[PDB]
Each structure stands twice: as C-alpha cells, then as structure tokens.
Design a protein around this ligand. Structure first.
Ligand SMILES: NC(=O)C1=CN([C@@H]2O[C@H](COP(=O)(O)OP(=O)(O)OC[C@H]3O[C@@H](n4cnc5c(N)ncnc54)[C@H](OP(=O)(O)O)[C@@H]3O)[C@@H](O)[C@H]2O)C=CC1
Ligand SMILES: NC(=O)C1=CN([C@@H]2O[C@H](COP(=O)(O)OP(=O)(O)OC[C@H]3O[C@@H](n4cnc5c(N)ncnc54)[C@H](OP(=O)(O)O)[C@@H]3O)[C@@H](O)[C@H]2O)C=CC1
Ligand SMILES: O=C(CC[C@@H](c1ccccc1)P(=O)(O)O)N(O)CCCCc1ccccc1
Ligand SMILES: O=C(CC[C@@H](c1ccccc1)P(=O)(O)O)N(O)CCCCc1ccccc1
Ligand SMILES: [Ca+2]
Ligand SMILES: [Ca+2]
Ligand SMILES: [Ca+2]
Ligand SMILES: [Mn+2]
Ligand SMILES: [Mn+2]
Lengths: 406, 406
C-alpha cells in the first residue's frame, strides 16, 4: 500500500522539505504517492512541482492565478489533473478517499482552516503550524473527539522529537491532543530544547537597542520569534496541548548545538531523547511513516565529530516572552489565543523597526492584562467564532497599545 | 497482580540495587513479591535480607555454610522458609510456578548455569551477567527458540538503554537474541557508550605502568575490565547477540560524563538515546516492569546543571582489548567463549599484581590465536558440554602462558 499524501503549502519551507524527503525516499523504493499540492499564489513554482510529481489534484488559493495555472499545466504531456481553486478546492481535496495524510505547511492563523477540514475528513494531519494549536487547542481537542479516526502527528521539530521517544504500543491507546496522553504514556516531564536564537549572549542594555536586522542577519516571522524566544513560549503551549503535559513539567533548556531535539522524562525518571543534525526532513518523514520508519540516505550522525553538547537555563529577564507564554498557558481559557494574536502584531512591529525589543513583551503583557476569561462555548461552531473574535480583538488591542504610546 | 521475583546473587552489587528499588516500589502497594534469594556463601548478609523480605525460598550455593544459615534464620519468628542449597536448590527455584521473573546478578561464567535453567522454565530473565551472553550467545539463542515463553530482558546499563530506546510496539513482536530483531526494530546502528575508565587519558608510556591499585582507588572484576575497556569489548559482543546487530554496526563512544547511556540509530538515521545519572536502579526496575514503567522517587536529571556532554572515539592502541573482542565476535564459533575465559584469567592476574597492563591483551590474544574452530554441536546438552570444555581449556591455556613467560 503506497502512502497517499497531500502537501498543503507545497512551495514554502516545510512544503519543499516534505517533497525533498519524499523525492529521495522514493529513489530508494516507491513508497509515496503525492496526490495533491496546494499553494496560495506561487503558480510558477506549483507548475514545476506538478511537472515532477504529477499529482491527481492541484489547488491554488488565489482566484487571480487560477486560469494561468490551467494554461501552464497543459504543457505537461500525458497529464490530466483536477485543477481547483480556493477554500472549495481545499475542501474537495480533504474529502478525497484516495488521500490518507495531509502535511499542513501553511503558516500563521490561516493554517488552522485547512487543519480543521483535514480533521473533519478523518485524515492523518502532519501539522507543522504551531499557531493553530496555540490559538485553537481546546477546539482542536473537541474536534478530534468528534472525528475519532483523525489524528494530528507533530512536525514541529521538538514535538516530533518527543513523539519519536514514545512507545507506540502506548501511543496507539490514545492520540495527540487527547486528555491523559501523558498519563497513558507514563510521561513525567519534558525538556524542550531551544537553539536560543541570535541574542542568547547579549546583556540587558544590548537587548534594549537590538534591531530586527540584528535578529535576521528561516522565514522572518519565526526568526524574530526565535530571537525573542517567543517561539519557544509558543512551543511550551504546543507541548501542553499535544501531549497533555502540565506547564510545571515543561522545562525550556538552551542547547546551542541543536543536536538533541528534545527529551522526555518518564515516571521512573528515565529520560529518552531524539538526536540528529538540525533537520526538518526527519520530523516531516516521521509524520508520514508513523508508526513505522523507512530507510533514508541521510548523513549518519557522527557523535565523535560533534564532540561537545551544552545545556543551560534561559534567562527570563532577557527573554520575558517565555514567562508570558507560561502565564498565558497556565491561565488557560482563551489566553493562548490572545498571546498568539498580540505576538503576531508585536513581531511585525519589531520586524518593521516600529518598536524596540522590550516593547514586544510590554505590548503582549498589556493585551493579556486587558483580556477577561470568557465562557467557553460547548457548540463547536460557536467556539470557532469565539476564537476568531478573540484573535481579531487581541490584534486590534495590540495595535491600539502601540499607537497610544506612539 | 504482584510481580513474583527471584534475585539470584542477592548479596552482590546488582542484587543489593535490585532489592533497594523493590523496597521503594513496595512502600504503599504490593508491586513485587520477593519469592527467592540465592547467594554463594554470604550467609549473614542473606540472613538480614531474609528478615526484611521474608522470601518463600532461600538458597546458598556453598553447602558448607548451610547449617549456619539454618541457625541464623530460626531467630526470625513465624517464618518457615524453604532453605535449599547448590545446583539442586537453584533448579527447584527456577521450576517453581510461583516465580515469574528472575534477576541474574551472579558474576562470571558461573551465571550461565542459572540463566540456562531460568530459560528452560519459561521465565523472564532479567540478565545483568554479560559473560553468559558472550560465552554462550548462540546456545542461549537456541534455548530461547525452544522455550518460547522465556525472555532475556537486559540489565547491563548500555543494553537497558538500547532496549528502552526501541519502540515497544516493535519489541513486543520479537524478543532479545531472536534472529531478525534488528530488522523488526528498524535498527541501523548502535552507539555503545562507555565511561572510558580511569586510564582513558594516559599516554602509552604512562599506561605501560598502571597497576590494579591505580584502577581500583561494582565488583572488582568489572572494575578492572572497565580500566582495560575489555568490559566494553564484552559489551560489543553482548550487543551483537541481544539485538542481532552486525559488528560493523556497533560503534564504541567514550562519554566520560556518563549521562547518555547508549543510542540507537534507526534506518531513517534518526537517533534515540537514553539518559540519566549513572545508576543501576532504573535498568533493574525496567527489566522487571517492561513493557510498563512505574513511578520512582529518584533524583530528576538536571541537564542544565550537568551543562556539558562530550564524546570521542577510544584509541585501540591504548585499549587493545576492544580490538580483540571485535575480532573474536566477528570470527564467531567459540572465539567469544575463549575471549571471556582468557580474560577471566588475565583480569585476575593483573588484579593480583602478577602481570602488567599490556600483558592482559597479550595473554588473551595468544589464547585466541591458539584456539582452533570446532564444529558446533547440534543438540543442546552436547553444545553446553562443549562450551564448558572450551571455557576450561582457555582458562588453562591463559594460566600456562603466564606460567611460561613467568
Ligand atoms: N520552517 C520551519 O522549519 C518550521 C516551521 N514551522 C511552522 O510551519 C508553518 C509553515 O511554515 P514555513 O514553511 O516556514 O512557512 P512558509 O511561509 O515558507 O510557507 C507557507 C506556505 O503556505 C502557503 N499558503 C499560505 N496561505 C495559503 C492559503 N490560504 N492557502 C494555501 N496555501 C497557503 C504558501 O503558498 P505561496 O508559495 O503561494 O506563498 C506557502 O507554500 C508555520 O506555522 C511555522 O511555525 C514549524 C517548525 C519549523
Ligand atoms: N555491578 C554493576 O553495576 C554491574 C554488573 N554487571 C554484571 O552483573 C554481574 C554481577 O555483577 P556484580 O553484582 O558486580 O557482582 P558481585 O561480585 O558484586 O556480586 C556477586 C553475587 O553473585 C553471588 N554468587 C556468586 N557465585 C554464586 C553461585 N555459584 N551461586 C549463587 N550466587 C552466587 C554472590 O554471592 P556471595 O555474596 O555469596 O559471594 C553475590 O550475591 C556480573 O556478571 C557483572 O558483569 C553488569 C553491569 C553493571
Ligand atoms: O522551531 C523551529 C525553529 C526555531 C528553533 C530552532 C532554531 C534553530 C535550530 C533548532 C531550533 P528555536 O529554539 O530558536 O526557537 N524548529 O522546530 C526548527 C528546527 C530546525 C530548523 C532548521 C533550519 C535550517 C536548517 C535545518 C533546520
Ligand atoms: O558496565 C557497566 C560498568 C562499567 C562501565 C561504566 C562505568 C561507570 C559508569 C558508566 C559505565 P564502562 O563504560 O567503564 O565499561 N555499567 O553498565 C555500569 C553502569 C553505571 C552504573 C554505576 C556504576 C558505579 C557507580 C554508579 C553507577
Ligand atoms: Ca559450616
Ligand atoms: Ca522505548
Ligand atoms: Ca548494516
Ligand atoms: Mn520548533
Ligand atoms: Mn555496562
């Protein structure tokens, strides 16, 4: 049985790493059928991928470049795809009975929409977009309880590492984002590793004046998130939701070599970790082969050559985004939504030289303080409406706080 | 529901660590039932253990301290144990329907005899004794093919580590020492971690001069073997047999902080590792709970405090015992039997200040070169007698070489 996969956001970083490892793995033996590709706007790139991979379905979000895609594709001999457009095309792909697994490599809040529909169709969802879990974790949980045969399999590297450390006999008794996942897998505690980002050695005074150029010189948004360690704060909430680990049992550790990707402490106090070169091919591949593994031709890890690994605790004073993520997660309710939203705005303000480093945490903290816990709707549709309303409110609030001071 | 366990070698390092962790696990709930304790002659220590754990059976190998044991144990009120001695006693305990799991913490080739009988009675054998696997790997594989419900669960720290790094969903479909274990578990290669012992950074001139005093100041035997890295050599052969990993796929790494206990590379090139403070309580406990894990109160690993982990290749010029073990393993047949036996002798000679460090590998090498391959008996009982004959031959040959140069 080949593995029938759709790639959503095929032309981006995650998407192109997915097709890479699929390509290489297929050269060893033909295991993967790429059944569908979906992008926003990159019509020429999508064309090139369709030419190589010959998928049954092509979809582009933006209506404006639909006709252009149809024209380009006719150049391809012996190939009659179903060529689609927009949300409707995304839903048609998700409901195909010939597709088993969907890689969600669509960034930002937009990525939740396809994630939702992939679950609704009881697919395996290889989810890279941590913001969907941070903004909508409780909703995704409820949804995964309606759609019992759907599964989220984590792609974010640290989360993939945690998942790889587990015994699948116990994993198969539950699934990601389920209450009691950690209890069933006998997990006590998580070490969430971090690169620490480019500002890891700067003083408070140096940080006061750092700029986005300093942080940038991956995509801009996750790069800024890595500089402030808000990425890791988002990943702490992601860990809580994915594995049902309490916040007091998630420890961020700075591992600048980026060889140990994260570690899992069980109840006996034994720790199991996943290691490799920094790499998104293995996380992606595992999400598509779980619960099995297949041969690759990747470079073997040469531990003697690596020689030295280092670990240290991040300073919360230098990286206050971490503290804010814990605070929001511990509060629960819609605070993680608010955190994610306000960080989207502040990240962009910093990227564009409108605010300073410590203003990022300042704005986020102020939005969080202004929010009030809301009765969580038991209706799935109403709940999604609440998440959207709170998201838009928090972004607006972030922007207001910025413009007040400015 | 209690797990019924026998501790063979109850008064030694492994045996005392086993009872220490069982004690802690039995504080509130009756998790384990200590059914039997077996020792060589340490009759007063056994007495004290009998008072604590009140096993159904006590057994002493040395019949000359039997009456002293019967004397000591009558002081314990409303306790009527079955007190047995020697090989007969051992076999009656292994035969009991009241015993599920046996921890083998008997040292040297002597530990093979209870290992074999434990397998012949379809028990779970929690095996610390590596010499039995090196000396009789092929024989134990054959025995485990006959005795279908018997299992060897490793307790040696690195081998427990490897075993934990595997996915139990795959492990559960095979068992250690079974052909095709590595295929079923998708294992590509093993990183077999070592402390490197006390002599790891000596120059060749310095190493010429080392004495047993230097190496000593666990059993004394294993302690000298750690110094010469013959322990690791034996462990390579143990790896090969337990996990069906080819010798070219076992890599010794020196990791002096002893936090990472060993690592498995899978066929996708993902590596999984097991880490903890140097410790034998986790390996022993896991051998008795596998495929589950239970709660301990061990000190949690503080990776930030450890701060630094290092890795390098051992020098084979400095640690020639490693090379000899690989050579012996790869030759197969009874060469591992001869390696282990000649080492028993050479280890003891160095321990007692009779030979120099490089004479250890010299003696072992000469015995290996002297040995001629033998047709492997096809029946169990003859194959065992052949192992014993060769083992005795190689010890005598070692002593003869020593006597001649001396
Ligand atoms: N990059 C990495 O290594 C890691 C990323 N992640 C997460 O992965 C997610 C994806 O990130 P990354 O690859 O970096 O992002 P990119 O910006 O590189 O790629 C996003 C992709 O989504 C497509 N897309 C955007 N909007 C739509 C839409 N409405 N419909 C369909 N396709 C759409 C884009 O199409 P187009 O080409 O037309 O613009 C593009 O192919 C993020 O949430 C990130 O946090 C997680 C861990 C590490
Ligand atoms: N110590 C450790 O941490 C490690 C040990 N191992 C392996 O575990 C095994 C045991 O090692 P260790 O505990 O250090 O050894 P010890 O020397 O500390 O203990 C030996 C135990 O075996 C008993 N014994 C010896 N001969 C017999 C016999 N004929 N019948 C019954 N009991 C007998 C001894 O009894 P008595 O007290 O009566 O002499 C004692 O209880 C070895 O094969 C070693 O390589 C593996 C990894 C690490
Ligand atoms: O979250 C992420 C990115 C952010 C984290 C990071 C950054 C660099 C390395 C490891 C971790 P952070 O700890 O700084 O927050 N992943 O999960 C990325 C992993 C590998 C990215 C990769 C890039 C280039 C080449 C191959 C791999
Ligand atoms: O084979 C062994 C002993 C020899 C190996 C060793 C020695 C020290 C630590 C790690 C490894 P070696 O690599 O030098 O051959 N184990 O598996 C021991 C494991 C740890 C147990 C423990 C022992 C002493 C004190 C507290 C803990
Ligand atoms: Ca006597
Ligand atoms: Ca495992
Ligand atoms: Ca091989
Ligand atoms: Mn990540
Ligand atoms: Mn060992």
């Amino acid at each position: 049985k080949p593995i029938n996969v759709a790639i959503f956001g095929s032309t981006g970083s995650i998407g192109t790493n997915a097709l890479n490892i699929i390509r290489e793995c297929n050269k060893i033996e033909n295991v993967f059928n790429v059944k569908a590709l979906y992008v926003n706007k990159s019509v020429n790139e999508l064309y090139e991928q369709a030419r190589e991979f010959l998928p049954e379905y092509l979809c582009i979000h933006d209506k404006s470049v639909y006709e252009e895609l149809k024209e380009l594709v006719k150049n391809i001999k012996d190939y009659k795809p179903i060529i689609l457009c927009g949300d409707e095309g995304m839903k048609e792909i998700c409901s195909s009975n010939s597709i088993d697994k969907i890689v969600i490599g669509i960034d930002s809040f937009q990525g939740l929409y396809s994630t939702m529909y992939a679950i609704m169709n009881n697919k395996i969802v290889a989810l890279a977009n941590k913001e969907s879990i941070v903004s909508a974790g409780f909703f995704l949980k409820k949804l995964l309880n309606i759609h019992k045969n759907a599964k989220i399999i984590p792609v974010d590297s640290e989360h993939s590492a945690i998942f790889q450390c587990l015994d699948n006999n116990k994993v198969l008794k539950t699934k990601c984002l389920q209450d009691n996942f950690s209890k069933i897998n006998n997990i006590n505690k998580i070490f969430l590793c971090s690169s620490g980002g480019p500002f890891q050695n700067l003083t408070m005074d140096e940080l006061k004046n750092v700029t986005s150029e300093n942080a940038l010189k991956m995509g801009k948004k996750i790069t800024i998130d890595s500089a402030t360690m808000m990425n890791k704060g988002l990943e702490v909430i992601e860990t809580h939701f994915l594995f049902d680990v309490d916040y007091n049992d998630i420890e961020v550790i700075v591992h600048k070599e980026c060889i140990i990707h994260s570690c899992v402490e069980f109840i006996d106090k034994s720790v199991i970790s996943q290691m490799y070169y920094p790499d998104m091919q293995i996380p992606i591949l595992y999400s598509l082969t779980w619960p099995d593994r297949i041969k690759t031709n990747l470079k073997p890890l040469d531990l003697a050559q690596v020689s030295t690994l280092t670990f240290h605790k991040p300073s919360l004073e230098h990286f206050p985004c971490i503290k804010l993520a814990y605070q929001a997660g511990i509060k629960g309710n819609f605070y993680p939504t608010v955190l994610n939203a306000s960080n989207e705005i502040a990240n962009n303000l910093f990227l564009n030289n409108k605010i300073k480093y410590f203003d990022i945490s300042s704005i986020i903290s102020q939005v969080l303080e202004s929010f009030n816990s809301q009765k969580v709707s038991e209706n799935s549709e109403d709940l999604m409406k609440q998440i959207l309303q709170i998201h838009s409110w928090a972004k607006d609030k972030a922007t207001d706080i910025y413009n007040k001071h400015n």
